[PDB]
């Protein structure tokens, strides 16, 4: 469901999409560990997009990754600017757009919110 290259950070500092492995940890809504259960492989010519954030950051996202929003969880085809993403100043979706396929990956953590925190922005994001 993300770009490989979409960093993401770890007790340790960061890591990848692309590296992260099952039994690794990444942060929580609330920023602590939160560990890697279950992924997926390196997924193949899946309709991706770009989300840009009003803390001037982007993710590079499949079409059925989920999102936390203010409105309950909704995948990236149905994201629309204006809204944000939320754990319960939450940032704002500044833009959506298609973009040419490329890798993307899934991970599932095992915090109750299921939510973990991607990009250079550290966006909660839902698994």
């Known amino acids: ?14 890591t ?6 099952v039994g ?3 942060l929580g ?11 997926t492989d390196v997924m193949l010519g899946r309709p ?3 989300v840009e954030f009003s803390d001037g950051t982007a993710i590079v996202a499949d079409a059925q990754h989920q999102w936390p929003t203010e409105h ?3 995948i990236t085809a149905n994201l629309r600017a204006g809204m944000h993403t939320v754990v319960s100043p939450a940032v704002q979706i500044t833009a959506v757009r298609r973009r040419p396929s490329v890798p993307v990956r899934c991970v599932e953590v095992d915090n109750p919110e299921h939510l973990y925190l991607a990009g ?3 966006v909660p994001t839902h698994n």
């Open 24 to 26: 690794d940890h990444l």
């Open 120 to 122: 250079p922005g550290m």
């Open 72 to 74: 309950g969880v909704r």
């Open 48 to 50: 991706c997009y770009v």
């Open 29 to 39: 809504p609330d920023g602590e560990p939160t560990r890697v259960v279950a992924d």
């Open 1 to 14: 469901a993300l770009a490989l290259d979409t960093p993401l950070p770890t007790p340790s500092g960061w």
């Open 16 to 21: 990848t999409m692309g590296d992260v492995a």
